[PDB]
Amino acid sequence: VPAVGEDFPIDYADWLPKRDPNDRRRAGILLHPTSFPGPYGIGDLGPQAFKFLDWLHLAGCSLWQVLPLVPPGKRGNEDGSPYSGQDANCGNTLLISLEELVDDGLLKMEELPEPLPTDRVNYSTISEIKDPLITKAAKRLLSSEGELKDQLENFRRDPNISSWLEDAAYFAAIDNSVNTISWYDWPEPLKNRHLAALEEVYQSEKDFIDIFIAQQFLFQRQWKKVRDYARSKGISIMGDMPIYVGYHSADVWANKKQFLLNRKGFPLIVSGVPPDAFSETGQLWGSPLYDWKAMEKDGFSWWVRRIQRATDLFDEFRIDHFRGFAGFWAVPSEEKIAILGRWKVGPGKPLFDAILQAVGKINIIAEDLGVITEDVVQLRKSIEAPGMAVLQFAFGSDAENPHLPHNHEQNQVVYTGTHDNDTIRGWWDTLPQEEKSNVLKYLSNIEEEEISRGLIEGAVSSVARIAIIPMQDVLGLGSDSRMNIPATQFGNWSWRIPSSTSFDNLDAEAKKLRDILATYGRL
Amino acid sequence: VPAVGEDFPIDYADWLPKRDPNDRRRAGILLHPTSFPGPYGIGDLGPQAFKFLDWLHLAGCSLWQVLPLVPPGKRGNEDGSPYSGQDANCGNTLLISLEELVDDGLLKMEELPEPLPTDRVNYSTISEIKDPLITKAAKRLLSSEGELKDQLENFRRDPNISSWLEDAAYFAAIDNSVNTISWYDWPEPLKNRHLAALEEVYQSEKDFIDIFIAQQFLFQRQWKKVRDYARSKGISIMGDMPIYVGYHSADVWANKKQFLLNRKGFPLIVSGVPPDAFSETGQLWGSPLYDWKAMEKDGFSWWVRRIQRATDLFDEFRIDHFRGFAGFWAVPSEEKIAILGRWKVGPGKPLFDAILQAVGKINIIAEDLGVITEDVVQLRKSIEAPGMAVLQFAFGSDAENPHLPHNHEQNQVVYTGTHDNDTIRGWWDTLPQEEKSNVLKYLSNIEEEEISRGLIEGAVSSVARIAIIPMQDVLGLGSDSRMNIPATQFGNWSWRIPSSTSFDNLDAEAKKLRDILATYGRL
Numbered sequence A, B: 001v002p003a004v005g006e007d008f009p010i011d012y013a014d015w016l017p018k019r020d021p022n023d024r025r026r027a028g029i030l031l032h033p034t035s036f037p038g039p040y041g042i043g044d045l046g047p048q049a050f051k052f053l054d055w056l057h058l059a060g061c062s063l064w065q066v067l068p069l070v071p072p073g074k075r076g077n078e079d080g081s082p083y084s085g086q087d088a089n090c091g092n093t094l095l096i097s098l099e100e101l102v103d104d105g106l107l108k109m110e111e112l113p114e115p116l117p118t119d120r121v122n123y124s125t126i127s128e129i130k131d132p133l134i135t136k137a138a139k140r141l142l143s144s145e146g147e148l149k150d151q152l153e154n155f156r157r158d159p160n161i162s163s164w165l166e167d168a169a170y171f172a173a174i175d176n177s178v179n180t181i182s183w184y185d186w187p188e189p190l191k192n193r194h195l196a197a198l199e200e201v202y203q204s205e206k207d208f209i210d211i212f213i214a215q216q217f218l219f220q221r222q223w224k225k226v227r228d229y230a231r232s233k234g235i236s237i238m239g240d241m242p243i244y245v246g247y248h249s250a251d252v253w254a255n256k257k258q259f260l261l262n263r264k265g266f267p268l269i270v271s272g273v274p275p276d277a278f279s280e281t282g283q284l285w286g287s288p289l290y291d292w293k294a295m296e297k298d299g300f301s302w303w304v305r306r307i308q309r310a311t312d313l314f315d316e317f318r319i320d321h322f323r324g325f326a327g328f329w330a331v332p333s334e335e336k337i338a339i340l341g342r343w344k345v346g347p348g349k350p351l352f353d354a355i356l357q358a359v360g361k362i363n364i365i366a367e368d369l370g371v372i373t374e375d376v377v378q379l380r381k382s383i384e385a386p387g388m389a390v391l392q393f394a395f396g397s398d399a400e401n402p403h404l405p406h407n408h409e410q411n412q413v414v415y416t417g418t419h420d421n422d423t424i425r426g427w428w429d430t431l432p433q434e435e436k437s438n439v440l441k442y443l444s445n446i447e448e449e450e451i452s453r454g455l456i457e458g459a460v461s462s463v464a465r466i467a468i469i470p471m472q473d474v475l476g477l478g479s480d481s482r483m484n485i486p487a488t489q490f491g492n493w494s495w496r497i498p499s500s501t502s503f504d505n506l507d508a509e510a511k512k513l514r515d516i517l518a519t520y521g522r523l
């Protein structure tokens, strides 16, 4: 620009305010792919994934949120949980479409099971039915010599893929063969990764390891087709990364120095949260904790790889318990409750600077719920990450409750509720009378019969640049359709869109969402 | 904070997010004091000012906005206009309360006029009635020897006051005696401020000048009592400063080098705005323009003093045509239309840095309406000034219209409408059918009979930290109560609260506003 008082160019008034496309207002639907309908006991990355994306596009949604896509819990008290991953980087092979494998010629139509009961995932039977079919497809791929074989070889040898996949495959092979509760009790040559012991595992467990890798390839190829189709329809996919990983995983076993373990590989201190204004007990989670000091010394190489894999799967993703990056609660591993721990200093912004330097700009959503400290807020703003608002948490205190729409900010994500909340209708049904009248006053004395439209419109009309609705709320469902009740160990993660509902029968629901997206500028 | 991975103090979780009191959510009423009811032809800084502040406090409002308090236009085509000030720094003596002067013993009850017609200010008769009474009070003060005389002497000699008041008094005295259209035609010794000519003006015009100063003192003392009472009730007063001043003023005559004048004191270039997407002609305003280059050389001393006087009157204030600080439209003074001008580079942030250094933090509101350029937005954010949203401008384009609530930001001021807009009911009455249905869809298909509650609630429920309602909208008034129709020359600035309405009869209106302030967190 010229000197003060001098002429601007003739065209000055054409220099209109800049609108960063990273600020675009968007709406999305939360729907885990297990919840897709179909005849094979669980949703998959097949025909219904494309039908869903067409319905999202018809509704004018530009985002799809999923839970972690990792191989879930197999213990009887977390069966199907996306948050009890066996591995941080692998894909859940139960999401592999039997129909897409028939198209590939890796399965025969004849080998597909007869139609299975359609309304809920049965996690105690689904692996016994699908696992042998996915294994069969992986064996046919390994013995083939065409296009798909070449792609498998390119995947296997890719430096980003092999950096997690080799360790995950050998871990699964040793776990399968040794079958102790944890790698802490493996024979010393396997526990401490003797080069010679690992070469002998590949000799004795070759078919297990090649099959494990081919299954991860079949997942990768299906997911990339879904993500390519999403992008073709203007849809971004938002994933979900828990800050911590499980002890019994390749993540810890093949990267022991990244964690605070004693000399025998047992965790010194484990994760949780202390008591606060809302909890008398706090929570003992019991994950191992990162050696953030040793990580800083190698430029956070372990976290950089974890983020690289996440950007391979997702356009953007939430980090659960984001506050752990500023400060984290650490319980001595011998303790049975949360109270006896201490706050430690998290890595803060340098972790994010190292990620930006190695991977470039990533779109992270900070899960920043509950009682957090000013350093958490400062860290989040310093990296310009959006936090979360959840409307189901907004109406039970006073007008300073940060979840109320007049307290929202532009760089934020607003939900009606997450996978951890009841549906809007279920929440409403158990809500005290005093909170209900408070909800109805706030939404400008709207009628109680319209609570769902009320909360959906309250999320969509927010200044928050992303609004997310659970699919259950679009379908008008009650408590029977809740994805998770926190701290219960049965009937979670099993909700599916019922057989009587199909995406081609949801035109009215699409139109109703699209009209409010148009009004509130999210198209 | 300690090293990464080390212990935080035991009290870590007590360090809750910081809430800057400069971010507090607040509501205010726009009401120019001329609009106060009472028996003397115009509102004043007397009993009704205190009654209004009590009603604001009962309604839970924490802000009161006024128009400029300067001595207004006396030409027949801008009679009463606060935006045709005779002076940037003086107070309008017509706002002086005859009743407060009786309390002081400067007027006798017997000298007050009989009750005058109460519903509209008559600008063609009000000066002839009040001027002689305020003059009488000023003469009694000048001949007195008590408390008020001492305060007058302290006011007169105050370095901040004398820096504008002496020039304003001598200007008014010469203007009164010489009586040309402008100071451009004054005799050379008065036009060019010969020291000897100015000493002779004080000899020959002593009573005019002493009276002018005593009147400014009586204004100052009344206004400070209003502002002290406001503060006692938790009310901030927001004023209004036009960026430009008038040519025929002490502001220009006593500060010629601050302006772009030729060697005879005639403006080289004058203010306006060029054509844009919304105007074929643009506007020729015709004020003189600042020599921003020469101002930078003395640390913007003229602007610093203007801001010092404004903070003497107001807690915070709007600057009209804030965009002039980044870039300003300059028309050669010989031209009769706006098209033939040029954009010049405004002073930008250094003006604001010099103000911060000399006066400390000030709360400025940027009037940033219409087509503005990215440099205007950049300047506003660089000084963290709030811009404006106006709901009457929100519903006539598409969903990207910045006045719609989903586009508001926290650091912003939202109005239903300003003194330049019709009332909500008047605007609604002339609004096209297509815009009306658009308004009703946006506010979630609210009933047309409730448009006023709809727009008031839409301003109060905004994320904007300040919401302002015109008093006319609280009283449910139509187009007959509009304060100004831009570019008309009759019947403007004359609306008063009618004689049948009193602040003690407005309890229901106070309660109705207070309840929505409570719901949307502005108490």
Ligand SMILES: OC[C@@H]1C[C@H](O)[C@@H](O)[C@@H](O[C@H]2[C@H](O)[C@@H](O)[C@@H](O[C@H]3[C@H](O)[C@@H](O)[C@@H](O[C@H]4[C@H](O)[C@@H](O)[C@@H](O[C@H]5[C@H](O)[C@@H](O)[C@@H](O[C@H]6[C@H](O)[C@@H](O)[C@@H](O[C@H]7[C@H](O)[C@@H](O)[C@@H](O[C@H]8[C@H](O)[C@@H](O)[C@@H](O[C@H]9[C@H](O)[C@@H](O)[C@@H](O[C@H]%10[C@H](O)[C@@H](O)[C@@H](OC%11[C@@H](CO)O[C@H](O)[C@H](O)[C@H]%11O)O[C@@H]%10CO)O[C@@H]9CO)O[C@@H]8CO)O[C@@H]7CO)O[C@@H]6CO)O[C@@H]5CO)O[C@@H]4CO)O[C@@H]3CO)O[C@@H]2CO)O1
Residues within 6 Å of the ligand: A073, A077, A078, A081, A083, A084, A242, A273, A276, A277, A278, A279, A283, A284, A285, A286, A320, A321, A322, A336, A367, A368, A369, A370, A371, A372, A393, A394, A396, A397, A398, A400, A401, A402, A403, A420, A484, A485, A486, A487, A488, A489, B016
């Ligand atoms: O031991 C134990 C056992 C054993 C072991 O160890 C373990 O592990 C376990 O186990 C196991 C099990 O068993 C099984 O079951 C399985 O599991 C599982 C599960 O179950 C499931 O669920 C899953 O999970 C997962 C999930 O899904 C995912 O998602 C994830 O999660 C996680 C996350 O991520 C993280 O982060 C965490 O979270 C959490 C947290 O931490 C905590 O904290 C909590 O939070 C919460 C809270 O509590 C509540 O309350 C809510 O909140 C809210 C509220 O409500 C509202 O209201 C709002 O707030 C606010 C307000 O409003 C305002 O007002 C403010 O306040 C304040 C005030 O102002 C002032 O004045 C003061 O005050 C007070 C008062 C107040 O009230 O009070 C009283 O009176 C007193 O006196 C005073 O003081 O202050 C205050 C404060 O400061 O503010 C506020 C704030 O803003 O809002 C909020 C929100 O935001 O909500 C929340 C929620 O968030 O909780 C949570 C939880 O949820 O964690 C999690 C976990 O948990 O992940 C997960 C995990 O993974 O999965 C799994 C499966 O696998 O398994 C196992 C084995 O392996 O057991």
Ligand SMILES: OC[C@@H]1C[C@H](O)[C@@H](O)[C@@H](O[C@H]2[C@H](O)[C@@H](O)[C@@H](O[C@H]3[C@H](O)[C@@H](O)[C@@H](O[C@H]4[C@H](O)[C@@H](O)[C@@H](O[C@H]5[C@H](O)[C@@H](O)[C@@H](O[C@H]6[C@H](O)[C@@H](O)[C@@H](O[C@H]7[C@H](O)[C@@H](O)[C@@H](O[C@H]8[C@H](O)[C@@H](O)[C@@H](O[C@H]9[C@H](O)[C@@H](O)[C@@H](O[C@H]%10[C@H](O)[C@@H](O)[C@@H](OC%11[C@@H](CO)O[C@H](O)[C@H](O)[C@H]%11O)O[C@@H]%10CO)O[C@@H]9CO)O[C@@H]8CO)O[C@@H]7CO)O[C@@H]6CO)O[C@@H]5CO)O[C@@H]4CO)O[C@@H]3CO)O[C@@H]2CO)O1
Residues within 6 Å of the ligand: A016, B073, B077, B078, B081, B083, B084, B242, B273, B276, B277, B278, B279, B283, B284, B285, B286, B320, B321, B322, B336, B367, B368, B369, B370, B371, B372, B393, B394, B396, B397, B398, B400, B401, B402, B403, B420, B484, B485, B486, B487, B488, B489
């Ligand atoms: O010559 C002449 C003559 C003479 C001389 O010289 C002069 O002076 C004169 O005079 C005198 C007179 O006569 C008497 O009467 C007296 O006076 C006076 C008056 O009357 C009164 O009134 C008073 O005044 C005062 C007042 O009161 C105060 O207040 C102050 O004022 C001022 C201020 O401060 C400043 O600032 C200024 O203002 C202005 C401006 O400048 C301009 O511009 C304008 O504006 C406006 C506009 O125009 C309208 O239109 C509205 O707007 C809005 C809209 O509507 C909405 O819609 C929104 O917008 C937005 C949208 O929505 C979106 O969409 C966007 O747009 C865009 C788009 O997107 C794209 O696409 C593009 O496009 C286009 C299309 C569009 O439409 O079109 C077409 O088609 C094409 O083709 C294309 O292009 O682009 C676009 C754009 O860029 O965006 C947008 C934006 O955002 O919103 C908006 C808003 O914001 O509104 C506005 C309003 O603002 O106007 C204004 C005015 O009003 O100035 C003023 C003044 O004027 O001060 C004043 C003064 O002082 O007082 C006085 C008394 O004294 O006197 C004398 C003697 O002395 O005559």
Ligand SMILES: [Ca+2]
Residues within 6 Å of the ligand: A175, A179, A180
């Ligand atoms: Ca086992």
Ligand SMILES: [Ca+2]
Residues within 6 Å of the ligand: B175, B179, B180
């Ligand atoms: Ca004259």
